[PDB]
Design a protein around this ligand. Sequence first.
Ligand code: ADP
Length: 249
Amino acid sequence: TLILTKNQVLHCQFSSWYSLFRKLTPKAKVIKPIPATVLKYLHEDSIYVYYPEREAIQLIEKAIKELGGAVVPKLNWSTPKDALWITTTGSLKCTTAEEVLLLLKSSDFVAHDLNHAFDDCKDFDNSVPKDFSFELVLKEWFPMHASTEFRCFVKSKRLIAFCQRDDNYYEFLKENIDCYEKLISDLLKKLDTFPDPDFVFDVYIHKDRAWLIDINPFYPRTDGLLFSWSELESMNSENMKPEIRLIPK
Ligand SMILES: Nc1ncnc2c1ncn2[C@@H]1O[C@H](COP(=O)(O)OP(=O)(O)O)[C@@H](O)[C@H]1O
């Protein structure tokens, strides 16, 4: 019953919401459109240990320098969180263009952005829409406490649910859940310019400050984590309290 439109996917591109919410979200640079030689390199399906032209490499490392020397890369929608297995350090942290490119090339999520981004859109048959372009996003890296990140579900512009984003129990959350809820609620009021009524936003809350991390479609390809999409779909938006789930001890 839940359907996904082309516009819903387009509205969640990093460039589309970073613009809206620059004051709420960690610093980032966007290279758009993505350099063609970079795009060409990212489609390689090699497993063993071509390369973009120097101009692209310098452009990327200019952005890295400007962000303080360490970044997390992504394309329009997906962060290559799945591709930690290929990094020499086990981290999303990239300090050179080589590291950025290796991480992006090895991600299933990134590959999904590149080849299948609009395949679930009922109003778009398949290939990409007019006036669309891929973009290379370099987010400033910062160490973040995995257990104070949340995924927050919005339906008819109301917060119906949110959950802990990682999978480790963290007792501090239980004692402080009303504080987290208020900060998430307050952030959602500041997302008033987001154009769709239903969506999913990720937040990092640190020292009483909420940071917007990502916005994704209200659709089962967005991991529901501690919620199932069956319950998210049926959940009533008129409730005055959101459902809150944390990892059990
Ligand atoms: N700027 C950053 N610095 C450090 N870690 C990050 C940064 N951005 C994202 N991460 C880590 O990568 C994971 C994926 O982040 P996100 O950008 O929300 O991608 P997605 O929404 O595709 O999961 C997050 O859970 C976070 O732990």
